[PDB]
Amino acid sequence: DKTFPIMLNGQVNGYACVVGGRVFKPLHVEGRIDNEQLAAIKLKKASIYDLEYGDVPQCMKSDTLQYTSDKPPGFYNWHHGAVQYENNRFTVPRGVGGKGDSGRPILDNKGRVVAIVLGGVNEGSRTALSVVTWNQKGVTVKDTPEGSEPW
Amino acid sequence: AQHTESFTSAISATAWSWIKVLVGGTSAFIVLGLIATAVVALVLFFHRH
């Protein structure tokens, strides 16, 4: 697999994922990654992005997710189904997302990572998501709506 | 002695030069770190916007 849930007391409180050869876990999600090979790597902190990262082992470097900074208007998908990307924010229908979906990546129509969801905001019709994405120049940025809560 | 001593009476120009270099060097180094700290935060802000 490519997504590795993070377990603290035998329950999943977030998910680790492997993108482009780096293992990304939310910084606010405490626990052990549900793996044996990827759990042994020391992780570097990226608290400005509320993430931690490390190098993928040699045997896992090829079986990882690719990502893109190209985000044309339209529909994107993730574990729970479709995601709307409009007005520069990723949003899901009310109640679709919630606590525990921390580190879950959002995929395009080709299965490429466009953002990593860290939290969200419940709006009138859809929940806005706090994500780590790549801007128009491909540089890592923290894309969050006003009042987002860690999931 | 006819004259009177003071704290700075015995400090030569060479000693003042070393004091100025020491104090100026350390202060400039800290200021360099603070300017770098301010600029990186400004650069990161522009990444978001």
Resolution (A): 2.9
Q: What are phi and psi of B45, to 5 degrees?
A: -55, -45
Strand, helix or coil at B35? helix
Q: Does A59 touch chain B (CB under 8 A)?
A: no
Strand order across the A3-7 sheet: A32-33, A3-7, A12-19, A22-26, A51-55, A44-46
Whether A11 contacts A58, CB under 8 Å: no
Q: What are phi and psi of B13, to 5 degrees?
A: -60, -35
Structure tokens, A88 = 């520069």
Interface test with A, best of B42, B47, B49 (most A CBs within 10 A): B47
Q: What are phi and psi of B36, to 5 degrees?
A: -60, -40
CA-based nearest residue to A111, from A139, A138, A77: A77
Q: Does A141 touch chain B (CB under 8 A)?
A: yes
C-beta atoms of B48 and A139 within 8 A? no
CA B30 to chain centre: 8
Q: What are phi and psi of A47, to 5 degrees?
A: -55, -25
- Which structural technique was applied? cryo-EM
Q: Does B3 touch chain A (CB under 8 A)?
A: no
Tally of residues, chain A: 151
Annotated catalytic residue A102? yes
Structure tokens, A125 = 């019709």
